[PDB]
Amino acid sequence: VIKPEMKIKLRMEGAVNGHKFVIEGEGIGKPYEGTQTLDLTVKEGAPLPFSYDILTPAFNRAFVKYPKDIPDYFKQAFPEGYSWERSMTYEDQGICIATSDITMEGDCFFYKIRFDGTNFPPNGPVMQKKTLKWEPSTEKMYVRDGVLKGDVNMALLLEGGGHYRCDFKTTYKAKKDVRLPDAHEVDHRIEILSHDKDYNKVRLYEHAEARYSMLP
């Protein structure tokens, strides 16, 4: 059902510290190799006054290299699809909430993404654009109340040297009942490959792989 090469089509609509925006995206990836690239274009609210880095993990857990000994909730969830709900709590009280509804027609995945953020200090690294990139991370996947969840301790590298912390809590929900996996981990590496001066056009890439915790 999930093809070796899958195209991506998306629209993100939201607001950060009251600044409304719309970003549409087109891309391609290799679900089985857990790699993807998106070409993102700002359609409304240009120029964005907050760091682009906060948005990137909202722009598909179907793009993960899953070992055969771990059930793949995301690929199994199709053709029907799945949705996700996420809260992103920053160390300085900035907070974002995002939802994504993921569908698929032929060889293309479609996402309708809603993204809202608030309480970012005007002099913080988000609003002042002091974020360089996200550190690679490990998402701990687990089941609660018969539903797939993912927690991740995220960190944005800052100009100057330090880290700026964010806690991600995602809830994943397939459109049909599908085999739920046992607790595992997804390693991630998200990077902006290129961008124009005000991030009106962004080339975004993610490489991710599933595995069990390497503790016996």
Residue numbers in the entry: 3 to 61, 65 to 221
Passage from the reporting paper:
eCGP123 is a bright green FP engineered for extreme stability, and was developed using a two-step process. Phanta was isolated by expression screening of a library targeting amino acid positions 62/63/65/69 and 191/192/193 in the bright green fluorescent protein eCGP123. Phanta contains the substitutions Gln62Met, Thr69Val and His193Gln. The protomers in each protein are typical of the GFP-superfamily and consist of an 11-stranded β-barrel (or β-can) with two small helices forming interconnecting loops protecting the chromophore from bulk solvent.
